[PDB]
Amino acid sequence: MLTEDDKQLIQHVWEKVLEHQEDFGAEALERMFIVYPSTKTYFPHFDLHHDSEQIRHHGKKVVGALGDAVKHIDNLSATLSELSNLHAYNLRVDPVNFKLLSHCFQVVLGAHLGREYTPQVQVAYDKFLAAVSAVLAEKYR
Amino acid sequence: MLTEDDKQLIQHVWEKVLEHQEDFGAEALERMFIVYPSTKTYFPHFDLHHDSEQIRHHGKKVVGALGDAVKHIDNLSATLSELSNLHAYNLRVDPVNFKLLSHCFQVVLGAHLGREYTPQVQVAYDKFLAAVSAVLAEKYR
Amino acid sequence: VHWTSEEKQYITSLWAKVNVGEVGGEALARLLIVYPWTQRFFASFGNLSSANAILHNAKVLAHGQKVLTSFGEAVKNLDNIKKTFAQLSELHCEKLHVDPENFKLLGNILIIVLATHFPKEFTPASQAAWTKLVNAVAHALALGYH
Amino acid sequence: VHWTSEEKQYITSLWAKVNVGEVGGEALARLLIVYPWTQRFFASFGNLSSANAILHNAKVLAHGQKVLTSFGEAVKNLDNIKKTFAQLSELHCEKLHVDPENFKLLGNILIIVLATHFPKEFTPASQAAWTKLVNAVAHALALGYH
Numbered sequence: 191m192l193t194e195d196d197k198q199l200i201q202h203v204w205e206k207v208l209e210h211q212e213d214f215g216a217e218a219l220e221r222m223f224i225v226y227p228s229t230k231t232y233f234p235h236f237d238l239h240h241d242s243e244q245i246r247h248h249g250k251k252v253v254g255a256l257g258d259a260v261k262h263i264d265n266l267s268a269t270l271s272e273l274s275n276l277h278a279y280n281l282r283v284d285p286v287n288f289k290l291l292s293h294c295f296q297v298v299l300g301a302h303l304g305r306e307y308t309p310q311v312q313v314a315y316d317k318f319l320a321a322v323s324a325v326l327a328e329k330y331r
Numbered sequence: 332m333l334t335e336d337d338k339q340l341i342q343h344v345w346e347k348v349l350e351h352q353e354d355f356g357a358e359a360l361e362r363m364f365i366v367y368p369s370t371k372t373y374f375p376h377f378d379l380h381h382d383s384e385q386i387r388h389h390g391k392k393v394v395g396a397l398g399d400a401v402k403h404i405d406n407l408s409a410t411l412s413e414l415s416n417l418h419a420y421n422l423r424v425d426p427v428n429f430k431l432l433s434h435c436f437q438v439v440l441g442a443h444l445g446r447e448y449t450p451q452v453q454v455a456y457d458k459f460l461a462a463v464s465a466v467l468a469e470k471y472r
Numbered sequence: 473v474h475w476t477s478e479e480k481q482y483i484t485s486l487w488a489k490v491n492v493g494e495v496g497g498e499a500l501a502r503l504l505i506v507y508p509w510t511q512r513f514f515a516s517f518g519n520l521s522s523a524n525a526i527l528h529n530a531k532v533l534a535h536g537q538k539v540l541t542s543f544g545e546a547v548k549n550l551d552n553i554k555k556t557f558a559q560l561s562e563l564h565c566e567k568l569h570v571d572p573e574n575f576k577l578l579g580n581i582l583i584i585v586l587a588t589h590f591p592k593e594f595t596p597a598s599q600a601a602w603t604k605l606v607n608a609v610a611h612a613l614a615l616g617y618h
Numbered sequence: 619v620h621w622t623s624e625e626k627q628y629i630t631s632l633w634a635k636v637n638v639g640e641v642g643g644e645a646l647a648r649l650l651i652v653y654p655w656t657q658r659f660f661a662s663f664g665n666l667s668s669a670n671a672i673l674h675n676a677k678v679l680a681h682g683q684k685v686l687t688s689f690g691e692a693v694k695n696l697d698n699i700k701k702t703f704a705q706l707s708e709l710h711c712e713k714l715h716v717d718p719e720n721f722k723l724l725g726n727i728l729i730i731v732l733a734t735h736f737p738k739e740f741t742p743a744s745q746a747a748w749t750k751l752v753n754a755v756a757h758a759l760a761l762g763y764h
């Protein structure tokens with residue numbers, strides 16, 4: 191699972207993310223939409239043009255939820271309970287897509303951190319994002 | 332997660348499995364070896380001919396471990412801890428293979444239960460086998 | 473995909489005995505029940521709110537029959553699968569946007585269903601040929617966009 | 619796989635700037651560190667017992683360079699990828715028995731590495747072309763047995 195070193199590497203990168211919640215989240219979403227266009231069908235009600243108000247506002251919410259997960263890393267299922275029911279029962283998100291967005295978020299992190307997105311940092315975020323993804327899907331099992 | 336109905340459906344099918352632990356486990360392993368021959372490379376020390384002593388003895392151990400998991404379904408990580416370290420640290424089993432063996436075990440169950448392997452039973456065992464697989468791999472995360 | 477005469481026989485032999493409507497209804501019902509996100513693609517099918525509702529859903533059953541009929545077109549022409557499924561590939565990928573992973577999942581469900589229906593005939597070797605079959609159909613449908 | 623002139627430019631343009639040895643060492647080290655089961659295939663490489671040991675492992679680094687050089691052969695001939703990787707496909711599938719899923723995983727790691735090395739150039743559109751690239755190489759290597 192996540193070690194204390196993992197958590198420290200995560201928070202160090204995160205306090206930067208929290209400074210630009212809207213930019214980061216929108217960039218992750220647009221990389222997903224552009225690289226994996228099938229994911230766009232979950233957002234027919236969104237204007238999906240670059241930097242649309244809907245993309246930016248939603249980006250901030252996604253990053254905000256991930257920030258909540260960072261705080262309550264040891265109590266993920268409970269903390270994300272409402273979101274889990276939302277993505278499974280209401281939105282019926284295909285689990286493969288949680289991996290796609292997780293991956294795109296890592297690309298955004300890599301782009302912004304450059305040299306500082308070390309293997310150790312990537313491992314930490316991979317474990318974190320996989321843990322969050324498992325929870326958002328746990329209502330399928 | 333697993334419901335009480337899931338657990339009851341599982342135990343009903345399982346007490347039959349426990350009657351022929353060796354047959355069931357060997358059949359699951361051989362379906363994996365034959366259908367997914369790349370898995371055979373984990374067993375170079377085994378005689379992999381049909382019904383070999385090594386396959387049958389190992390089959391019984393696999394079924395026995397699954398039987399232990401059934402008993403301690405609410406405490407899986409702890410119960411399988413030693414096995415988790417074995418498959419991750421020692422054997423370095425690719426997580427995809429846990430899904431292959433899980434699938435082959437379901438085929439064996441379907442073959443032996445016929446009509447009684449209902450969708451409800453399949454769901455129950457799918458959730459169970461996925462939970463066991465997650466634990467045997469959790470040392471990778 | 474270089475089928476051996478023995479593989480072709482495992483496939484054509486078993487399929488001739490298959491109740492397409494029954495196996496098809498089972499496969500689709502099990503897809504919707506075991507992997508609930510797949511229900512996203514069947515909003516027009518009416519009540520899917522429980523396993524029992526799904527198993528009694530007339531359109532789920534009818535649709536499963538059409539899907540297994542489609543698999544039959546692979547069985548009937550084992551060397552031209554890629555081409556047989558070209559139109560369906562376009563349909564699932566460009567129109568429906570079904571992630572290819574789910575093609576693999578339906579294939580695994582069909583393997584299990586065939587096992588419950590043919591305990592004797594569905595030997596490990598038979599399973600190998602049929603797994604090669606459902607994977608070839610999944611691959612052919614995945615060409616749709618990769 | 620029907621590359622647009624724009625995609626080909628995103629690929630050839632970025633690759634010309636790539637430090638193959640550096641990006642290759644990073645990609646392979648990250649594969650071994652992020653997905654530890656992949657270490658199974660590198661028993662002869664010596665100490666892989668920690669992330670820092672892996673990053674300082676000379677053969678891991680040299681091997682990563684050869685792997686990224688191989689990707690370069692896809693970049694250099696975008697319309698003949700399937701054929702360029704036929705021998706490697708046989709190697710990874712029939713000799714090494716690497717599950718194809720891991721080809722996809724290495725591809726994703728390379729996408730992330732390219733992002734850390736080219737923050738400006740690696741736009742969503744560039745990522746799309748490069749993701750199409752690594753997926754085509756993974757698919758070509760997976761032909762080895764399916």
Ligand code: HEM
Pocket residue numbers: 229232233248251252255256273277281283287288289291292322323326
């Ligand atoms: C990193 C994992 C993810 C997290 C933390 C996450 C978080 C959230 C949150 C917090 C909301 C609610 C926003 C609000 O209340 O305004 C939301 C909505 C939504 N999510 Fe996700 N999500 C994730 C992955 C996905 C994926 C993979 C998809 C499918 C491609 C998806 C599709 C949606 C949709 C369609 C909505 C409805 C939003 C609207 O109508 O504005 N999500 N998500």
Ligand code: HEM
Pocket residue numbers: 370373374389392393396397414418422424428429430432433463464467
């Ligand atoms: C349903 C999930 C699985 C369970 C419950 C399980 C359980 C076990 C147990 C209890 C043992 C030890 C037997 C003994 O002490 O004699 C074992 C050994 C082993 N397992 Fe698994 N296993 C699973 C999946 C896998 C998979 C997917 C692979 C790889 C294809 C694998 C490869 C091995 C190997 C190589 C050994 C060493 C056995 C020997 O040398 O006799 N296992 N497993």
Ligand code: HEM
Pocket residue numbers: 510513514516535538539542543560564568570574575576578579609610613
């Ligand atoms: C790889 C095995 C599959 C085969 C051979 C297959 C075949 C077909 C065929 C032949 C049709 C047209 C039915 C007609 O004639 O009315 C169809 C429709 C459809 N399929 Fe599939 N399919 C497969 C997998 C999937 C999966 C995995 C999904 C999603 C989870 C899916 C979702 C759909 C949907 C939504 C339709 C539209 C039907 C309607 O609106 O009534 N299919 N499929």
Ligand code: HEM
Pocket residue numbers: 656659660662681684685688689706710714716720721722724725755756759
């Ligand atoms: C899909 C991207 C990949 C490409 C393009 C690729 C390419 C290559 C090439 C060109 C070689 C020969 C190296 C030489 O000239 O000495 C090689 C060797 C090898 N590859 Fe890969 N490979 C890929 C993925 C993988 C994966 C995912 C694994 C397993 C996790 C793997 C395991 C190996 C092993 C074990 C060798 C043998 C090398 C030795 O014994 O020194 N490869 N690969």
